[PDB]
Amino acid sequence: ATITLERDGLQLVGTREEPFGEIYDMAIIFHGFTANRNTSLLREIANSLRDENIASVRFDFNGHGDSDGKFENMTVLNEIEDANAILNYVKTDPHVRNIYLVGHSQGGVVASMLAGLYPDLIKKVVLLAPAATLKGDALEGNTQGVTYNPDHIPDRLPFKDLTLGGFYLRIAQQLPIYEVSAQFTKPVCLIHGTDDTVVSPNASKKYDQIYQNSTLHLIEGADHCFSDSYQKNAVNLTTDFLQN
Amino acid sequence: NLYFQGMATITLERDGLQLVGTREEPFGEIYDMAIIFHGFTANRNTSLLREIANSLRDENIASVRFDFNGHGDSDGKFENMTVLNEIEDANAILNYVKTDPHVRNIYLVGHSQGGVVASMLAGLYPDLIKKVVLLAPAATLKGDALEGNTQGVTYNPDHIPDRLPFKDLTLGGFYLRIAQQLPIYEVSAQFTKPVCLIHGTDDTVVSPNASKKYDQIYQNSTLHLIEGADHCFSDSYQKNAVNLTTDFLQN
Ligand code: NA
Ligand code: NA
Ligand code: NA
C-alpha cells in the first residue's frame, strides 16, 4: 500500500508492491528527472516482479510527485540521500531477503551511483536509459534544450514549467557518475533503445565498457520513456534478469 | 547593517532541517563576508571559530558560523550526517549570504572537516568565492575511510556497518562509504582564486601532507607550516592562526 519515510525533515511517500509470502526479495524502483514514482513503465515493472515472487518500492524524489521538498533545491546528490533513506527501510525490513535496484533516466544515475556506495548490499542493478549524459550536458551549457553559460551558472533557471536551482547544475557538472558506479561488480542489466532522443545510447555503451558483469540490450526502435509496444520488452528483460 | 552590530543568532532552513547560527556584523552597510565551518563532532562556537569571527570584525569583515546537522543547536541525528549533506548545509548558507544587500565579497573558511566542506564548495562556486582559508583541512578522512580507522575506531572498509559506536555518539555507515569515495581533490582543484592554507607540524589528527597536497593542487596557494602547533590552534598557536586568516583577508 502507500508507505511513508523521512530524509532530513522531508517526507518521502511511496507505493510498496507486496507479494504473497513471509520471505521474498525486494526491488527499489527509482524514477527520472521531472517523472514520478507511479508512471506506466515503472508501474508495470513493479507489477511484473510481484507476479514472479519479487517485492518492490517506488518513491517520489524530493521536489517530485507526492514527496516533500522543493524542485528548486533538488540535486542528483540529495536524491541519492533519498535513495539511501529508502535502502535504510528496505535493509531493516524483516520480510526482505535480497535487494535489487532498478533505475530509469536520472534514476539510472541515482541507482548505479547508490549501488557504487552499496556494492556489498545490492545484489543486481537494472539500468534503463541512464541519464549519465546529464554531466556532459551541464558542462556545455545546455540541458534538455534550456541554455546557460557553464562558467556562469545562475541561482535559478526556468525549466519547462518548473524552476531548478544552480546547485543542481553545479553538482551535475562534477558528478563522479561512472567512477562511483564502476565500484559495483555484481550483475548489471543495461536496457537502451536506439531511438532515444533525451539520453544518448552512448551512455549505456560507456556503462557496459566500465562494468565487470553487465549485459547490454540495445532494443532497435525504442524511444526514451520506453513507450507503446517497446514497454513490454523492457519490462520482460528486467523481470527475466531479476529472477535468474 | 551598522546599527545592529556585534553578535546575532540566525536560523536557516535546509531541505526540512534547522541550521542555527551566529552572525558577527561590523560598521557600514556594505562589508565582506566570511562563512565559517567547524570540524567533525564540534560546533560553531569554539575558541578558534570565536577568535576568527571577532578578529575579522575588528578589521570590518562580517562572519557567519553555523552548526552542521547532527552538531550543536542544528537539527538532525549525528548518525545521518555525511560530508556531502554538510556541503548542502554550506550551499544553503551561501544561498543566504549571496542574497544579502550588505555583502560585498564572499570568503570561505573551514577547520578540519569544515576544510573539506570549504574546498569542495569553493570548487563548486569559483565565480562567487573570492578567497579561501583552510586550517588543518581533514582531506585525510577519505584515506582514513579506505583503511578502516576513523579517529582510532576500527571497522572493515569492505563491509562497513549500518551504524558504528563513536567517542560519545554513533557514526552513520553511509558517512564512511561517502568520505571513502569523496572527490575532495578533484572538486577542490577547480578553485583558481587565492587560497591560504594553515597546518600544524605536530598535528596527529590530520597529516600536514593534506595541506601540502592541497598546496600542490592549487593554482594560487600560500602554505603556512606553523611549528609546534597541533590540530586545534590553542595557547601560543591560536593567536598565530587567527592573524594569518585575518591578514590574508586584510585589504
Ligand atoms: Na498492495
Ligand atoms: Na522476520
Ligand atoms: Na560528490
Numbering used by the authors:
A (entry chain B): 2 to 245
B (entry chain A): -5 to 245
What does the paper say about this structure?
We previously showed that LJ0536, a cinnamoyl esterase purified from L. johnsonii N6.2, is active towards a variety of substrates including short acyl chain aliphatic esters and phenolic esters. The structure showed a canonical α/β fold characteristic of esterases, and the enzyme is dimeric. Two classical serine esterase motifs (GlyXSerXGly) can be recognized from the amino acid sequence, and the structure revealed that the catalytic triad of the enzyme is formed by Ser106, His225, and Asp197, while the other motif is non-functional. The structure revealed a prominent inserted α/β subdomain of 54 amino acids, from which multiple contacts to the aromatic acyl groups of the substrates are made.
The apo-LJ0536 structure was crystallized in the presence of protease, which facilitated successful crystal growth (the mutant Ser106Ala was also crystallized in the presence of protease). The resulting fragment included a loss of four C-terminal residues, such that nearly the entire full-length protein was visible in the electron density map (1–245, plus the five residues from the expression tag). The asymmetric unit of the apo-LJ0536 crystal contained two protein molecules that formed an extensive interface. This interface is formed by α4, α6, and β1. As calculated by the PDBe PISA (Protein Interactions, Surfaces, Assemblies) server, which identifies interfaces between proteins by measuring their buried surface area, the dimer interface comprises 34 and 37 residues of chain A and chain B, respectively, burying a total of 2373 Å2 between the two chains. The interface is primarily hydrophobic (18/37 residues from chain B), although there are six salt-bridges as well. Due to these characteristics, this interface is presumed to be the dimer interface of the protein. The presumed catalytic pocket resembles an open canal-like feature, which has the shape of a boomerang that ends in a hydrophobic pocket buried between the α5 and α6 of the inserted α/β subdomain. Overall, we observed no appreciable differences in the backbone structure between the apo wild-type (WT) enzyme and the Ser106Ala mutant (RMSD of 0.33 Å over all 244 Cα atoms). The inserted α/β subdomain of LJ0536 adopts the same conformation in the apo and ligand-bound structures, suggesting that this is a rigid structure.
